[PDB]
């Protein structure tokens, strides 16, 4: 289905997603313990390059 | 000769139309039947579209604080992230938030049983996540300090506390429309037949 949330961004790994390396991004969900943002952090750190 | 080809063209054109309609109807019924509602606490532990919460100032929040379940820990992390935004103090504030907004409210089974007897629009999800007792504190040397397990336990065995508990809160369609359209077509055919 159409995505409409970051939860479905965490669910769907076919669409690649990331952010800026340094700054507020990649630090907010790095320290976060919410499972959606933790899975998104794991996916982004898997594709850090 | 050409009229037979014309009728065959209409025949498989109508076949193509009804095959497309059958495919769309099958897709709609499949996506409707594939959907599932919330039926566990792990649904709230994973899905973050529906915001949730509890009361403030401890009680359940203390069990969130010292949680070791590692899914209840995720629920505590989300609730601490949304402590200032989506969280209420009393039970009635969260209960109306369930009815108004897409909100789920974590409570004891007694109050949830009370509001589901009160309103038929409410439902209970999940079993006993954290086993919680309710009692009455007692003086030192009080008779009911020992008689909570002796006399008040005997009143519970006689069900008088259960008598108070049971005293206070106690306890097609589109096819028919298609048939209506068919009857209207029968009416039109009789009106043509006059």
């Amino acid at each position: 289905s159409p995505i409409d949330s970051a939860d479905d961004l965490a669910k769907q790994t076919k669409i690649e997603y990331g952010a800026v390396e340094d700054g507020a991004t990649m630090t907010f969900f790095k320290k976060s313990k919410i499972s959606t943002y933790d899975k998104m952090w794991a996916f982004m750190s898997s594709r850090r390059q | 000769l050409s009229t037979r080809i014309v009728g065959g063209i209409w025949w498989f054109f109508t076949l193509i139309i009804i095959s497309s309609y059958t495919a769309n109807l099958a897709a709609f019924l499949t996506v409707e039947r594939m959907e599932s509602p919330i039926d566990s606490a792990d649904d709230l532990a994973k899905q973050t579209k529906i915001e949730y919460g509890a009361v403030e100032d401890g009680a359940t929040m203390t069990f969130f604080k010292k949680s070791k379940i590692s899914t209840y820990d995720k629920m505590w992390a989300f609730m601490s992230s949304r402590r200032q935004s989506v969280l209420v103090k009393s039970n009635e504030e969260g209960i109306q938030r369930v009815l108004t907004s897409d909100y789920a409210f974590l409570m004891e089974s007694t109050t949830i049983e009370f509001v589901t007897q009160r309103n038929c629009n409410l439902t209970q999800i999940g079993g006993l996540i954290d086993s919680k007792g309710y009692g009455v504190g007692t003086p030192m040397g009080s008779p009911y300090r020992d008689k909570i397990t002796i006399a008040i336990l005997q009143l519970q065995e006689e069900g008088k506390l259960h008598m108070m508990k049971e005293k206070w809160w106690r306890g097609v369609q589109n096819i028919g429309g298609i048939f209506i359209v068919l009857a209207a077509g029968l009416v039109l055919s009789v009106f043509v037949a006059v």
């Binding site: - | 089974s109 009692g135 504190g137 506390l161 429309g177």
Partner: protein, 97 residues
């Protein structure tokens, strides 16, 4: 009926089943009500909490329960005729006409 004692049921002055403040360490609410010269005897259960069970003579709970989720339920129906009302456009029915 157990004892025959006299009692005056009264509202609490804080309105809280109070926990502590970790910036101060003092325990407030009903826990402070048992230390602020009202009743050294325990009164309120504050449900079950571990430090609340460390109060002077916390009795056994008479009632047992658990924590679950209250959630409103969704409901919907499809009355009338909806074979003509597919997610496909009515211009397909115009093409049929």
């Amino acid at each position: 009926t157990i004892l025959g004692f006299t009692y005056e049921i009264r509202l609490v002055e804080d309105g809280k089943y109070g926990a502590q403040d970790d910036v101060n360490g003092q325990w407030n609410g009903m826990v402070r009500e048992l230390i602020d010269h009202k009743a050294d005897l325990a009164v309120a259960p504050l449900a079950i909490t571990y430090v609340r069970e460390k109060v002077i003579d916390f009795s056994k709970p008479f009632m047992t329960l658990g924590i679950s989720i209250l959630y409103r339920k969704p409901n919907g129906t499809n009355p009338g005729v909806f074979s003509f009302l597919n997610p496909l456009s009515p211009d397909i029915w115009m093409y049929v006409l």
